[PDB]
From a paper:
The AP2 adaptor complex (α, β2, σ2, and μ2 subunits) crosslinks the endocytic clathrin scaffold to PtdIns4,5P2-containing membranes and transmembrane protein cargo. AP2 consists of α, β2, μ2, and σ2 subunits and is the most abundant endocytic clathrin adaptor (Keen et al., 1981; Pearse and Robinson, 1984). In the “locked” cytosolic form, AP2's binding sites for the two endocytic motifs, YxxΦ on the C-terminal domain of μ2 (C-μ2) and [ED]xxxL[LI] on σ2, are blocked by parts of β2.
Here we present the structure of a form of AP2 in which both YxxΦ and [ED]xxxL[LI] motif-binding sites are occupied and form a coplanar arrangement with four positively charged patches that are sites for binding the PtdIns4,5P2-rich plasma membrane. Crystals of the AP2 complex with bound peptide grew under a number of conditions, but only those grown using mixtures of ammonium sulfate and lithium sulfate showed useful diffraction. These rhombohedral crystals diffracted anisotropically to 3.1 Å resolution in the best direction but little beyond 5 Å in the worst. The bowl of the AP2 core and C-μ2 could be seen in the resulting electron density. It was immediately obvious that a large conformational change had occurred, as C-μ2 was no longer located in the center of the bowl but on an orthogonal face (compare Figures 1C and 1D). The most spectacular subunit rearrangement, and that of the greatest biological significance, is the movement of C-μ2 relative to the bowl. In the open form the linker forms a four-turn helix, which packs in a trough lined by residues from β2, N-μ2, and C-μ2. Surprisingly, electron density was also visible in the [ED]xxxL[LI] motif-binding site on σ2, although no appropriate exogenous ligand had been included in the crystallization experiments. Inspection of the electron density suggested that this “phantom” [ED]xxxL[LI] motif was part of the myc-tag sequence (MEQKLI) inserted into a surface loop of μ2 (residues 218–252) at residue 236, given that at low contour levels almost continuous density could be seen extending from the dileucine-binding site to residue 252. In this “open” form, the myc-tag-containing loop reaches over to a neighboring molecule and forms a vital crystal-packing contact.
Author numbering:
A (entry chain S): 1 to 142
B (entry chain B): 4 to 582
C (entry chain P): 1 to 6
D (entry chain A): 9 to 621
E (entry chain M): 1 to 135, 142 to 223, 236 to 446
């Protein structure tokens, strides 16, 4: 399963965080700051999978942006790297050309869309369509 | 004010792109960006060829920054590290001596197995020069070389060249020469150190004056090695050196002490330069707990050793080593121990005061160290002991587990100095024992219940409790519990079948531990002969202890003396548990 | 403040 | 849309030091406390806008202490965006309150008991998103009855499945096992691939704890898969990621068969083979898109397939080919793919069908480990040799790990030392190489050794004989070495202790010399070690009349007798006493040879398994 | 010697890093980041070993400064070096901070490389370095800098000329005192330093001396002058010096004679205990009312001459490990308290020569254990006073320059006497 989802920026600002069981506070802050310590230091010829202790995080870049998923060990690395990207694509759809200020200024959409394609620590919807359908056909009215 | 930093996208490639520019400005700014990212951690070998192609210049900021990148990656690609040869060998030939020197020092930093040979001649004609900046660099380079690929015969031309360098027109020269010629006298063709005598030593001392901070420290940390023929040498050397109410502070001062502390062999009470020397050596050694914190902690480690080796120096400076509440912990613990070194016939009253005050503190390590200390005071002189023991009992009864435990440990070492005395306590101790979950606590407590079992009709229940999970208990626990039980048995055989039984069994039949199994066995091959020789062997009366409270091994010590300035002292271990 | 030396 | 949030954030971004941020912030916080407290508290943009601003401040890195009931407001509602906003703030934050909690649940069921998409939806997303016990206490016979013989919106069906997976995720006791199993594994087959997805996941856990229960899932997941993998080059276009068909569904079904050992009914097992075969062969094929993602989706499937193959062990051919492919992958331009093959083929090596199959690649791996130079990677490589080792290998694999240890961290150092020790113990043909290799770890590492390693090499030298006069020799030359580790002194100590007689003939090794040597070693040595050198000193007495003078001379001077520590006292005394008193014929009888150790249990492997994870 | 040398920001990133030796790794810099900068186990020491590598470090700002070796270097030395370094970086731009460091890469390096080679520290000063380190010439300047750096007066001399020709000596003296429950000086000492700020010309030979035992009997002589037999003339427990004083010549003649650095350099450290002047007496007592009141009392007294000015008064008094309801009173200055950090701090502006001031406190009591008590930490003081707490005063400063014409009589010479805190205890 998914333990969690992060979207961090270059700076360290947690432009998204998102959790999937019991967790703490000072804990979550640590998780984050050290996730960052890992990810920001990497590069091209480094794997988008990093093993840490008794979990592993699958992690991808975009501009100055780090979309991270931390997950179990028995889990499907590639699969998850691609989940990340497919989702990033749906947002590229939604904001019809997405950059981070989009997720800042519209963080709640973001939350509700992640919710739309991740639940209980699992994959909800893979379809670029069915997501963008329900997303927009119920975006329609306030 | 012009930094660069940042990371991402693929700007290492973009970095290559602008690293190849027409206007030298986008290139300079490039090399800088590169070093910045090299310093943060990025992999930038991917750029090597281009950056060294930049080193092909005459502007010093850039030359320098390239040179940096050059050390650092030059090792891992000998292949394109070919690049520099012509540039450096031409630079080793410059107008500007600073440029020659930057060349020579950058050069010998690149360890590629044929750069050795390409520099060999620049360096040979560099250890000669109408410039001491050069020659400074040249000696340092010879050491730098001897670290890689270097035994070399020409390289022996360099050895000689380096030794002849010592006796120079210049200080800096000789600082780096002495320094080098010493770092080198590691590689052991047994003939290490190489030389030093009359001329060498006299020249070296006049240097000791006319040199620099560090240069000096190099002359002391060198000198801590000369073996003076008689005592003429001993004296005029100790004196020639003496002046070290000095400056590099710590360093010169400590080395001063290292060298100085060494030439104490000349029969304990001579025309007592010896004792003027014993006076002389305490003032500075005290000033030292008045540097920044750091150089205190180093100074204290060093003292603690000195006090141990020669205790008649800070004999009644005991006052000095009293603990302030705003000394940083490490200085605290050092101090405390150095107090208990000196505690004697006089100081005890206020000492026990101070200690009684420390226990009350919150830093757990401190608290303990001091409760220990009290106990250790008991062992140092007796009267003390009665009052100490009492305070300690009180202390146990303060119900705080770890203080309980440290208490127990000490109290054992006490019974071991005062057998036939504090027997009365044991039942007490035993009540609050079932909460000793530390190794030394169990060790001491079990050795106790072992020892004084005749007293303790209870002991069957206590030891046979301990045998539940006999494994997953410290070897020191086990080992100690074992001798403890054969002890019990020997004295109380009428109740101890199943006990030497199952201890002997456990010890002998399953222990992966060789020393344990092996001792399981050695105590089976006695209780299978004679009490006659069993009693005679185990329960034999065992000599006392005396003035000793956690001393360091005597010889070990003799050699940590030889290692005063050096981490050895700090760590209190020969240089061999760090290669 | 200070006071003259000499 | 709505104005404020944009204004606010614009401004909050357009700031000075994080403190001016804090000023503006606390201005809005006090302004919201006071926009809250009293008056005609408005509807849309007002409640939405400000609740949204509290969420944003919270999620800026600040805290919210106040008016969250004055936010629980929005839940049961006319508008979506107020519902969504309310649910959002409540899922993102839950404080020290219970009244709140029961009002939130009230809103939950009073919103849930509807007949349309986003209500059912938003609430399910909440329950599944956070929720305390009362969610699983009050809604645990709820979701099963949601999906029994009863049909809802696919989006809802989905959120329902995943919700129930949440409610089994934290409250097993509070999960009933009713007659709904059949429509769970009927609506697996079901049309919508999202439904199939979630279901596949849930069913994966449920059957992870209850195999017998979903024994139907099998066949259906099978046909569903083979269907997915060979359909047509344009099939269910909605559910193809960069040209690959439904890869996370495949991957989730692959994962779903891995809880079941080799499929029974053999037409099923047939299709499964035939298919896995297919998958394998499609990896054979060529890139259908230059774009890295396509490649990846495909490989995800391939990798999970390989895995189902390994978990099975019923296919020899399949295994061999998984090896072959994984083989091709180890030198890939891509790093994820090397690293993933390495991992995978390590997992693989435990099947004996593929063991020579694997061995072939030794060259490659020894090269990765020697070269790669990232490290996650080499760690995978070294795990893979250790993995692939038998007798032949063993000789080389060991030589290699030994240099490899001439360079690594701390953690790794120890674990490598542990493996080199288990390989050389398990595989040594000649046992002089075994002593040599252990003596080697001590040299290259020492500080990292562990202890079951020196206990074991000790153990072994005693138990083998033929090994001994050699061991003794070695250990003696090796002790007289210059810089000199301590476990060498533990080991040489013991060994030369209880076998020094074998070597004792040679003028270079008389016993005097053995002692003096061990003795320069003594004076810098942890207690336990010195306990060792003492007891050797007594073996050395009884095995060596010759010397006894010097030995007693030593274990008699104050230093060891008036010693500060119990063991070295007890000992120094006891051994004094058995030279002193002791018939001879007793001393002897005591210090006998020392029986062979039984064939133990292997502490070492034990340690390594404890280090695992 | 010195192998690694690495500087970090507080969050854990490198800022600058420079390796003089093959021994060291990427490993090193990490490990330190990993192990000192990050171990949940704060309490340490300042040297470490990780895995046959030793790591020293200082903290400045919140900015860590590490040096690394894999030999048995001289402890002390490498430390003194990190010190000398921080002084060189201030020397170049004062504030040692993340932004201040980052925005200076190229320098720091040119330095690092200069200051210290192959781990062997070189010429470390700042009056050498300022002369050949940018932030342009020939053989002249060239061999000038060369022979100056290599020579015996590196440390800050070349060929110097000033528009206004002056020197200031500052006597800065810390009073370190630990004083038992009810007044008795258990640790009674003063640690002093002579900070000399000198703007001079050329190669000016200084001699120097203080109070040290004699008996008595221009066109700007003082008006009054003593005569009356100035006894108690005080001699110095121990003095250590600066790099410039001819310690051979001193050991011999007991003169303090040198050629000085330009600017604000520290000339000697020294300590005294004998015929010591008393400082600032602290009287601390705690009492009880009912089963629910613990009441705390601090009285402050001062020991001056009649006429004088006690400055920047700060008093630290502890609350019990926890505090119920604090109640604080003052009779001069103003009162400060801080909670969760748990302590009480009194701040006083001005205190006259030989005063007496009261400070009060109250703390409520409700059940915290089952019958367990507290143990009171020492009460601690911070201050500035214009006496010279030892009773030192500068007797003389000879200033002979052979090159230029001028000598002693031409020099504006100012002296200050400042008496700072340091270490200052009790409540028992």
């Amino acid at each position: 399963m998914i333990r969690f989802i992060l979207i961090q920026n270059r700076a360290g600002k947690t432009r998204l965080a998102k959790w999937y069981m019991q967790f703490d506070d000072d804990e979550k802050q640590k998780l984050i700051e050290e996730v960052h310590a890992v990810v920001t230091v990497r590069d091209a010829k480094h794997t988008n999978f990093v093993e840490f202790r008794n979990f592993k995080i699958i992690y991808r870049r975009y501009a100055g942006l780090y979309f991270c998923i931390c997950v179990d060990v028995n889990d499907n690395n590639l699969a998850y790297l691609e989940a990340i990207h497919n989702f990033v694509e749906v947002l590229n759809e939604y904001f019809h050309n997405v950059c981070e200020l989009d997720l800042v200024f519209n963080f709640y959409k973001v939350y509700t869309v992640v919710d739309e394609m991740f639940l209980a620590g699992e994959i909800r919807e893979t379809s670029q369509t069915k997501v963008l359908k329900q997303l927009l056909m119920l975006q329609s009215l306030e | 004010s012009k930094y660069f930093t940042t990371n991402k996208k693929g700007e290492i490639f973009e970095l290559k792109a602008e690293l190849n520019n027409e206007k030298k400005e986008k290139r300079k700014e490039a090399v800088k960006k590169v070093i910045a990212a090299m310093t943060v951690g990025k992999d930038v070998s991917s750029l090597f060829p281009d950056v060294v192609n930049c080193m092909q210049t005459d502007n010093l900021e850039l030359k320098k920054l390239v040179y940096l990148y050059l050390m650092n990656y030059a090792k891992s690609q000998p292949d394109m590290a070919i690049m520099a040869v012509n540039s450096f060998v031409k630079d080793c030939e410059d107008p500007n001596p600073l440029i020659r020197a930057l060349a020579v020092r950058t050069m010998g930093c690149i360890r590629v197995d044929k750069i050795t040979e390409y520099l060999c001649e620049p360096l040979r004609k560099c250890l000669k020069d109408e410039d001491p900046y050069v020659r400074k660099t040249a000696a340092v380079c010879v050491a730098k070389l001897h670290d890689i690929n270097a035994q070399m015969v020409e390289d022996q031309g360099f050895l000689d060249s380096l030794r002849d360098l010592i006796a120079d027109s210049n200080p800096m020269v000789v600082a780096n020469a002495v320094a080098a010629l010493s770092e080198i006298s590691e590689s052991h063709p047994n003939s290490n150190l190489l030389d030093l005598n009359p001329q060498n030593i006299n020249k070296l001392l006049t240097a000791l004056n006319e040199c620099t901070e560090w240069g000096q420290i190099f002359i002391l940390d060198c000198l801590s090695n000369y073996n003076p023929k008689d005592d003429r040498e001993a004296q005029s050397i100790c004196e020639r050196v003496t002046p070290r109410l000095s400056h590099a502070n710590s360093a010169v001062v400590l080395s001063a002490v290292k060298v100085l502390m060494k030439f104490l062999e000349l029969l304990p009470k001579d025309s007592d330069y010896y004792n003027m020397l014993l006076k002389k050596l305490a003032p500075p050694l005290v000033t030292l707990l008045s540097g920044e914190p750091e150089v205190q902690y180093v100074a204290l480690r060093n003292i603690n050793l000195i006090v141990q080796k020669r205790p008649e120096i800070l004999k009644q400076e005991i006052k000095v080593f009293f603990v302030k509440y705003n000394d940083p912990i490490y200085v605290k613990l050092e101090k405390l121990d150095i107090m208990i070194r000196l505690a004697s016939q006089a100081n005890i009253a206020q000492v026990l005061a101070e200690l009684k005050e420390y226990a009350t503190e919150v830093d757990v390590d401190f608290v303990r160290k001091a409760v220990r200390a009290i106990g250790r005071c008991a062992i140092k002189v007796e009267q003390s002991a009665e009052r100490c023991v009492s305070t300690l009992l009180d202390l146990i009864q303060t119900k705080v587990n770890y203080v309980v435990q440290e208490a127990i440990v000490v109290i054992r070492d006490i019974f071991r100095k005062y057998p036939n005395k504090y027997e009365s306590i044991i039942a007490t101790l035993c009540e609050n024992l079932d909460s000793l979950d530390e190794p030394d606590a169990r060790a001491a407590m079990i050795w106790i219940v072992g020892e004084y079992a005749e007293r303790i009709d209870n002991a069957d229940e206590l030891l046979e409790s301990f045998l539940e999970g006999f494994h997953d208990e410290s070897t020191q626990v086990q080992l100690t519990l074992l001798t403890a039980i054969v002890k019990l048995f020997l004295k109380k055989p009428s109740e101890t079948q199943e006990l030497v039984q199952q201890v002997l069994s456990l010890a002998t039949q399953d222990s992966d531990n060789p020393d344990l199994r092996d001792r399981g066995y050695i105590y089976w091959r006695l209780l299978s002969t004679d009490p006659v020789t069993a009693k005679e062997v185990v329960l034999s009366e065992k000599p006392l202890i005396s003035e000793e409270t956690d001393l360091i091994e005597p010889t070990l010590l003799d050699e940590l003396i030889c290692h005063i300035g050096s981490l050895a002292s700090v760590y209190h271990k020969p240089p061999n548990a760090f290669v | 403040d200070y006071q003259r030396l000499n | 849309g709505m104005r404020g949030l944009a204004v606010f954030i614009s401004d909050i971004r357009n700031c000075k030091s994080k403190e001016a941020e804090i000023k503006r912030i606390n201005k809005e916080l006090a302004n919201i406390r006071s926009k809250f407290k009293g008056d005609k508290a408005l509807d849309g943009y007002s409640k939405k806008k400000y609740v949204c601003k509290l969420l944003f401040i919270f999620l800026l890195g600040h805290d919210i202490d106040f008016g969250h009931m004055e936010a629980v407001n929005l839940l049961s509602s006319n508008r979506y965006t107020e519902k969504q906003i309310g649910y959002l703030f409540i899922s993102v934050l839950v404080n020290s309150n219970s009244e709140l909690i029961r009002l939130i649940n009230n809103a939950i069921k009073n919103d849930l008991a509807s007949r349309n998409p986003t209500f059912m939806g938003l609430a399910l997303h909440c329950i599944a998103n956070v929720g305390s016990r009362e969610m699983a206490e009050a809604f645990a016979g709820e979701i099963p009855k949601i999906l029994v013989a009863g049909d809802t919106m696919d989006s809802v069906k989905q959120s329902a499945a995943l919700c129930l997976l949440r409610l089994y995720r934290t409250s097993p006791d509070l999960v009933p096992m009713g007659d709904w199993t059949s429509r769970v594994v009927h609506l697996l087959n079901d049309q919508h691939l999202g439904v199939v997805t979630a279901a596949t996941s849930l069913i994966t856990t449920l059957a992870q704890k209850n195999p017998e229960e979903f024994k139907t899932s099998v066949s259906l997941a099978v046909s569903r898969l083979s269907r997915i993998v060979t359909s047509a080059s344009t099939d269910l276009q909605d559910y193809t990621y960069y040209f690959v068909p439904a890869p996370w569904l495949s991957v989730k079904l692959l994962r779903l068969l891995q809880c079941y050992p080799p499929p029974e009914d053999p037409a099923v097992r047939g299709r499964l083979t035939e298919c896995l075969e297919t998958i394998l062969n499609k990896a054979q094929e060529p890139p259908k898109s230059k774009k890295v993602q396509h490649s990846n989706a495909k490989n995800a499937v391939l990798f999970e397939a390989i895995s189902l193959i390994i978990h099975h062990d019923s296919e020899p051919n399949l295994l061999v080919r998984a090896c072959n492919q994984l083989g091709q992958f180890l030198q890939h331009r891509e790093t994820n793919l090397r690293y993933l093959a390495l991992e995978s083929m390590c997992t693989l090596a435990s099947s004996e069908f593929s063991h020579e199959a694997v061995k072939t690649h030794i060259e490659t791996v020894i090269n990765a480990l020697k070269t790669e130079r990232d490290v996650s990677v080499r760690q995978r490589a070294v795990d893979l040799l250790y993995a692939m080792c038998d007798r032949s290998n063993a000789q080389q694999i060991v030589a290699e790990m030994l240099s490899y240890l001439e360079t690594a961290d701390y953690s790794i150092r120890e674990e490598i030392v542990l493996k080199v020790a288990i390989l050389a113990e398990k595989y040594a043909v000649d046992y002089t190489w075994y002593v040599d290799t252990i003596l080697n770890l001590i040299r290259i590492a020492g500080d990292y050794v562990s202890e079951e390693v020196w206990y074991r090499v000790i153990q072994i030298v005693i138990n083998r004989d033929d090994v001994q006069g050699y061991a003794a020799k070695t250990v003696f030359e090796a002790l007289q070495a210059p810089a000199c580790h301590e476990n060498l002194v533990k080991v040489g100590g013991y060994i030369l202790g209880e076998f020094g007689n074998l070597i004792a003939g040679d003028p270079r090794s008389s016993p005097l010399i053995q002692f003096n040597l061990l003795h320069s070693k003594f004076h810098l040595c942890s207690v336990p070690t010195r306990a060792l050198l003492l007891s050797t000193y007594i073996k050395f007495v009884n095995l060596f009349p010759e010397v006894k003078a010097t030995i007693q001379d030593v274990l008699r001077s104050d230093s060891q007798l008036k010693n500060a520590d119990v063991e070295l006292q007890q000992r120094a005394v006891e051994y004094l006493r058995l030279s002193t008193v002791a018939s001879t014929d007793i001393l002897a009888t005591v210090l006998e040879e020392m029986p062979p150790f039984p064939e133990r249990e292997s502490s070492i492997l034990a340690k390594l398994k404890k280090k695992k994870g | 010697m010195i192998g690694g040398l690495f500087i970090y920001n507080h969050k854990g990133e490198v800022l600058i890093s420079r390796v003089y030796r093959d021994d060291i790794g990427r490993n090193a810099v990490d490990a330190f980041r990993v192990n000192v900068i990050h171990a949940r186990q704060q309490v340490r020491s300042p040297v470490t070993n990780i895995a046959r590598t030793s790591f020293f470090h200082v903290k400045r700002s919140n900015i860590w400064l590490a040096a690394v070796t894999k030999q048995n270097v001289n402890a002390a030395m490498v430390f003194e070096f990190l010190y000398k370094m921080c002084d060189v970086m201030a020397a170049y731009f004062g504030k040692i901070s993340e932004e201040n460091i980052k925005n200076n890469f190229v320098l720091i390096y040119e330095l690092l490389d200069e200051i210290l080679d192959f781990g062997y520290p070189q010429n470390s000063e700042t009056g050498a370095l300022k002369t050949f380190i940018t932030q342009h010439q020939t053989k002249e300047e060239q061999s000038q800098i060369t022979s100056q750096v290599t020579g015996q007066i590196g440390w800050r001399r070349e060929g110097i000329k000033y528009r206004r020709n002056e020197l200031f000596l500052d006597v800065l003296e810390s009073v370190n005192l630990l004083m038992s429950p009810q007044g008795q000086v258990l640790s009674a000492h003063v640690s002093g330093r002579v900070v000399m700020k000198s703007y001079l010309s050329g190669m000016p030979e200084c001699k120097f001396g203080m109070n040290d035992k004699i008996v008595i009997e221009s066109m700007e002589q003082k008006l009054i002058s003593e005569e009356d037999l100035g006894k108690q003339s005080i001699a110095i427990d121990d003095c250590t010096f600066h790099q410039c004083v001819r310690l051979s010549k001193f050991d011999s003649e007991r003169s303090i004679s040198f050629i000085p650095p330009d600017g604000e350099f520290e000339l000697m450290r020294y300590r005294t205990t004998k015929d010591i002047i008393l400082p600032f007496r602290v009287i601390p007592l705690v009492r009880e009312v009912g089963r629910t009141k613990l009441e705390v009392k601090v009285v402050i007294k001062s020991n001056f001459k009649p006429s004088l000015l006690a400055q920047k008064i700060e008093v630290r008094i502890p609350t019990p490990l926890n505090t119920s309801g604090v109640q604080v009173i003052c009779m001069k200055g103003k009162a400060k308290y801080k909670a969760s950090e748990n302590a009480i701090v009194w701040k006083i502006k001005r205190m006259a020569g030989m005063k007496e001031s009261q400070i009060s406190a109250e703390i409520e009591l409700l059940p915290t254990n089952d019958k367990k008590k507290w143990a009171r930490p020492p009460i601690s003081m911070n201050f500035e006073v214009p006496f010279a707490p030892s009773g030192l005063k500068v007797r003389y400063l000879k200033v002979f320059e052979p090159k230029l014409n001028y000598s002693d009589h031409d020099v504006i010479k100012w002296v200050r006497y400042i008496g700072r805190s340091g270490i200052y205890e009790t409540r028992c």
